[PDB]
C-alpha cells in the first residue's frame, strides 16, 4: 500500500524496430494518423513490464495475470479455487477472489485487470496506469522488406519487418495511492515497477522491435496522496524536444530532456531514474 | 501542377532528376532502363550521391541525343532547374523528399507533354 | 408521435382485414390442441406443431392474451383456455407437478369461472368435464403426443371442440365476447386517465405488453421497471400513462411490424416501417431496399430499381407520396427497447431519400464485380465493422446512418470516423466502405458541413483537385504498380499503408514514391509500365505537395480516390485508352 | 427450485430472471455467448424480496417460451 | 406576456412512454417551459402559464447513452454502488435547440400581501435580462443547460415556418393540484401539440 | 452556505485516452454525430468528481452514496444525508422519500462537455498475449482477441456548470464544499486514471463567481467570455498548446469574479 | 543455458558489396531514406549467422530450420513426430515441439521462429535477438551496371543489352546491436556452448558468406557487455553508446575501418558488466 501518489513521465526510445506494431496496419508501428507520431499503447509497455516481472520475479505474490500462454479463466477459477474465497458466498466471493489475485498476480496489483471472464472475479482500476506513449516527433516507419528463404508451406516468401529509425516515446504513467489501497500495491511492488520501467526494454527484445531502450524516468512523487497539483503541470515540466538543428531524429542525442525541478517547492519530489 | 519557380529544394532536385530521365530516355530510345529506375531511391534520399554521376553524364547523353534543338532546350530546362537548386543538399528530409518525387512527376508530365518544352524555350 | 403512430397502424390493421388481434387476444402459437366433445375425455388430440424449418409450436391462433406468470405465485394466474401443460392437464413434467397441480387448480377455477361467467358454450362445459376427467388425457400426454420433456414446444397447448375443427374454443365467438367484456370490466375497475396516445381518459396499463422481436427476448416497449426511472410517484408503469386498450393497440401493431416483412434488422437496430395510409406499396419494400437481400433471393435489393424507376425525375411522383411513414428504430438494450431513430416521413420524402442514398453510395464497380450494383444498407453497415454487426456501433453509426439514408440527412461524422477506422484497420477499401465514404462526403458537401470540395461522382473524377482524392489516386496507382511488379504477393502496399497513406501522406508517400520506379521497371510489359507512369503523372500533376497529415474529410476523399483508381486501373482498357489519348 | 434470478455484470444492465437454476445457468450462457469479459453472473434473489421483482416486466420466466430467444 | 428564449446545445424532454430510454419530446414540454420559467423566478405565489412555445431551431435528434443508474437514492442503503445498479440508458436527445416560450405567470392563491403582478413581472424581467435564475434552467434534463434571454418581440428565426409535424399528445404542466406543498403526488395532464404551425400553441387547461 | 451562484467553465483535455466511450458505440469516445465534436457527458465529470471526493475526503460529511465498488473497499433525514454524503448536496440526489417527489436538486449542475474542435478517435487494435477461455477464443493458430482501445489523440472539452447557491442552501452545500468541488474538478483527473481514459487533465477552471444569489449576468454570455479555440496555425490538434484560452474579464467587473482556478 | 545476459555491438563493414538488398528497391542496399544511412536487416545478419552454422556445425542439435530449400512446415511436422506425438497430448504438444526443435535447430534456440504455421509447434522469441542494424555513416550505393555476355532465353536473344545491376556499397561500418536474453535463453535452452558458436558466427560469419553482391563484408568488432546479473546491470543503451564509432575527423568520404575511429570505452561501465572484445 504505497502512500505518496506517483505521476511519472517515461522516456523510452525505439532505435530500430516496431515499438508497438498496429495489427490493423500489418505490423506497422502504431502511428497517430494525424501527427505521424508513433503510439506505443498502454498495453504495450504494460505487457513488457509484465514480461519483466515474469523474467525477474518468478514467484507467487508477483506472478503476472496475462501470461504468454494463458487461458484467463484457468487463472480466474484458480482464484475461485482458493479457501480465502472458496467459502465466500457471492458478492464477497467476487471481491475476495480479486483480493487473492491482487495478492499474487503482480500485474493485477500494478496495472488493472478485467476479471469478469469465468467465475467473475472483480475488477482493479490499476494503481499504476501507463497512458499512451507518443513519439515526440513523427517517426519514419521503414517498411523493411525481408525475405524468408524457407517457404512456410508446401510451395522465397516476401515479408515485412517494419522498423522506425528512431522514436523518443513519452509515456505518462499514473500510480494512484487510493487505488493502491484497494489493490495492495506495495511500496515493494512499486519499486519492482520502477526496476521494470528503467529496465523493461533492456529485458524485452524481439526481431520486430530490435533496440528499444528506456531513456528517462522522471517521477513526481505527489506528497499528499491528494494531487499536490495537476499532473499536467508536472509532465509539462519534463519538456523534451529536438535539439534545434536536427530535423531527422536518429538518437537520444537528437533530443534534449529538460527537467524543471526549480519550482517544485510543493514537495513533489522529482525523482530522476532514467535520465 | 508543375511550378516554374518552386524554389523548394527537394522539389527542384526531383525536377532535375526527371528532366535527366528525359534526356537519357530520348538519348537511348531503344534502351528501356531509366535512371529513374536505377537511382530514384537514392536520388531522392541522397541527392548528391547520384546527381554527381548523372550530372557528369548528361552531355554524353546529349551527344547520343540526336536532334539538336532537343539537346539545347534540355540544357535550358537544366538551366532554370539549377537556377532554383542553388546547391545540392547533403540529403533530403521527408516532406522535401516526397517533394523530390513530386517534382520528378511534374517534369515528366512537362516533358512527355506533347509540345510544351520547345514553346517555353522559345519565349525564353 | 411514437405510440400514437403505432396506434394509428393498429387501427389500420384492424380495419383493413389484416386480422390482427381484436383488443383481446394474442396470436399465441398452440403446439397442440385437444379436440373435445361435450364431455371431452380425449375425443382426439391434434398436434399442430407441424411447421417450418423447425418443428414449431403450432398454428397461429389469436387466443386470449397470455396473462403472464411473473414467477413466484405463477400458479395463481392462468391463461383463459390455452395454457401450460401443468395448468391444463396437470401433466407432471417433473417434481414440479405439485405446483402444476396448483396450476391446474387455478386453471380449472379459471375454466370453471369461465363456465360460470360464460355458460351455454359447449366448449367451456367440455373443458370443465375434461378437467374433471383429465385422466383420459393423463395417458394421452404420453399416448398421442408429448411436450418435449421439460417445458418446451409442446407446452402452451390448448382446446378445440369437435363439430367446428377450425375454430378454437379459445377463439370461439362466445368465449371471445366474454374475454373482451372481461378486459373491459377489469379495465373499468382500474384508474381511468390519461392516454398518452389517444389522449382520452382511459385505463392506464401497467406492464406494457412486452413486444417481441427487437431484443432476442420479447421485451417491453416501454416499461419503467427499475426504481429510479419511476419518476413522479406513478411508480411502475403509470410513469408512462397509456390507455390499456391503446396499450394493446400499439403493442400488437409493433409486434406485427416487428414480425412482418418490414423488419430490416440492420445489426442491432431493428427497424419497423409503417405507412399511415397502410400498404403504401413502399411499406413492404422499405426493408427490401434498405436490406431485404437476405442472400437467398439475391435480387430483392435490386428491386430498388422498382423504387428507382418510380422516382420519375428524382422526386417521388406517385400519388401515394404525401402519406407518411414513421421509420421506428428499435434496438436492443437487454431488458428494454431503445428507440434509436424515429422519423415520421412522407414516403415521397422517404423514397426520395432512398434515391439520394443509393445515389450517394453509388460508386463504380469493375465489369463483373462481385459487389451488387445497389449494395444493401445492411451490407454497407457491415463494412463499417470487422464483420457482423453486433459489434457494429449501433446508434452512433447504424441508427444515424439509416436515418440519414431514410431522411436524406447528412451522414454523421461518426460514419466517417468509423469508416476511416475500418480503413486503417483493414488497410483496404471495400466497395462497401468506399461507398459509405462517398455517401458521407457527397452529402456533407450538399450540406456544407464539408466545404470547398465538389460532389464526388461514381465515375473517377480525373479532373479532381482534392488533395485527398488526388492522393487516393496516387496510392491506388502505386497499388496497381506494386501488384503488377510482384504479381504474386503476400499483401500489397495498400494492405500495409492505407492507414498512414490515408492520414499521413508524407510519412509513407515519400517512401512509396521512392519504391515506385523499382516496381515500375519490374512491369512485364513496358507499355503497361509507361501507361501506369502516365496515369501517376496525371495524378501528381494535380497535387503540389504531400500534406503532413489529412483531415478526416480528406482522409475520406483519399479513400474514395483510391477506390476509384483501383476500379479505374482494374478496368480492362481504361488506363490504356487514356494513355493512348495522350 | 424456481427462483427470481438477478443477472449482473460489471457496469451492465441488470437482467432479472425467473426459472430453474439450470434455466438461469443456460440463460447466463446465452448472455455470455460473446462476452469474453463482463460475463453476466447469476444470483439468487432472497425469497422475501421476490414480490418486489415480481411484476417487473424485465424478467424472463420458466415458461415454455422463456427459451425461444436462441 | 413575457417572451423568454430558451436555448441550449442539447435538450432532453423525456417521453413519458419511453422514459426508460429517453425519447426527448420533439419540442419542449410546456411542463418543461413551466419549470424553466420557474427557474428564472418562482416564488410560490406564481404559477407559470406557458402561452406559446415557438421552435427556434429545427428538431435535430442526437442519441447518446449515459451509463446511467436505476435505483432511486435510498436512505437506508449506505451507498448506491452503481456497478451493481447500472442501467445504460440511451437517449434520443434534442440537440442545439432554442424555444421562444411566450409565457406568463398567474398569481397563485398562495399570493400573500406583497403579491403585485407587476412586482413579479418586473422581478422576472430583471432576472432574465440580468440573466438571474433560481437554478440554471434545466432544458428538459438539468444535466443540460439553458441559455435564456428575455426577448421583447422576436429575435431569432423560427425553423418550422409552415404547419409542421404534429408531435401528438405530450406532457403539460404535470398537475400538482392533488399534491400538498411540493408535489407529493400528481397526474400527468397530457395535452396536444395539435399544430406546431411555427410555434406550438400551448393551451391553458 | 455559499451565497453567490457560481457559474463556471471547465477546460479539460484527454491526452491520449478514452474520455468516455459511447455505451452505444462499443467504447469509442462520445462523438457528436453531425459535428464530430467529442462529447463527454457531464455525468462523466460528475462521476469523476464523486470518485475524487471518495478518494480524498474519506471521512464523514464527505461520502458519495453513488460510489463505485471499484474505488474504495423526511426532510430531516434528507438534511442529515445532505450533511453526510458529499455527492448528495454537491451534485444533488433523488430520495426514495423526499418532498419534490424525491428531488434533491443540489447545486452543481453540469453540462455535456463538448470538445472544442472535432476529435479523431484512434482505435488502437490491441492484442492479449493470453486468452479469456480455453475455447474458440483459445485458437491454437493464435489469440485473435483483437481488443480495441478507442482513444482520442487529443481533445479540449468545455464543461459548463452552474453551481446554484439556492440549492446549496436547500442542501447545506457549504462554501467549503464548493471549494472542495473546484479542487476536485482540478485534481480530479489526476486522481482518476484508467487504461481507457489514458491521461486526462484539467486545463483550466474558469469560475464565474457571481455576487447576487439569484445571479449577476446572463450565464451564456459569461461562458462566451471563456473563448478557447485552435491557434490559427494548427489544423490538427496534438496538445493543449494547440488551443488558445482567451479570458475576457473586461466588462466582468459588473459584479462577477472570474476566478482562474484551473489556470 | 545462458548464465549471463549479453548485450553486444557488432561492427561490420561492407566494403564494396551489396550488404542487404531491399526487394522493395530493386536490390540496392537498404538505405535509410530520411538519413541516407545504410541498413542490414537483422534478418540478413542473422541469416549470415544461420549460414555460418549450416557451414560449420552441420549436425543434429545445430540445424537451421531455414535451410535454403527447407519447407518450413515439413521441419515443423517432423518436430510433431519425434516423441511428442503422444508424449504430449494437445496443448503441451506444441510446447514439446518447441523444446524439440530447439534441441535440434541451432537457429531456433538462437533466433527462434514462428512455428505455428503448419502443425503449430509454438513460438520462440529468440534469446539472441539482433537489432535491425544501421550504418554509422551514410552509404552511397554505387549501382554498378553489368551486362549479359550470353542472354538467358532465346526470346531476348537477338551486344545483348540485358544489363543487370550489381549494386554495392563503397563502404559502411554497419553497427549492429545484440541482445542476448538470459531470461529467454531458459525458455529454449540456447546454451553457453551455443553461445560461443554464435560468437564464432559473428566473427567469422561474413568470412563464410561471400557472394557476388556482398562484396567483402567483415566483422570489424564484436564488443560485448556481459551483464553480470541476468538482470541488466545497466540499460543496454548506456552500454552501447559507450561503444562509439565516428568518422575520423579529417575524412568526409568513408572508405575503411581505418576510416572510422572505434572507441571501445570501458572506464567505469565495468562495474559488473564485462566488456570483452572478440571483434577487436
UniProtKB/TrEMBL annotation, chain D:
It comes from the Viruses. This is Uncharacterized protein. It comes from Rhodobacter phage RcNL1. The chain holds residues 10 to 79 of 84 of the full protein.
TrEMBL record, chain E:
Keywords: Antiviral defense, Endonuclease, Hydrolase, Nuclease, RNA-binding. It comes from the Bacteria. GO terms for molecular function: endonuclease activity; hydrolase activity; RNA binding. InterPro entries: CRISPR-assoc_prot_Cas5 (IPR021124), CRISPR-assoc_prot_Cas5_N (IPR013422), CRISPR-assoc_prot_Cas5d (IPR010155). It is an enzyme of class 3 (hydrolase). Signal peptide: none annotated. Its EC number is 3.1.-.-. GO terms for biological process: defense response to virus; maintenance of CRISPR repeat elements. It holds the Pfam family Cas_Cas5d. CRISPR (clustered regularly interspaced short palindromic repeat) is an adaptive immune system that provides protection against mobile genetic elements (viruses, transposable elements and conjugative plasmids). CRISPR clusters contain spacers, sequences complementary to antecedent mobile elements, and target invading nucleic acids. CRISPR clusters are transcribed and processed into CRISPR RNA (crRNA). Belongs to the CRISPR-associated protein Cas5 family. Subtype I-C/Dvulg subfamily. This is pre-crRNA processing endonuclease. The gene is cas5d.
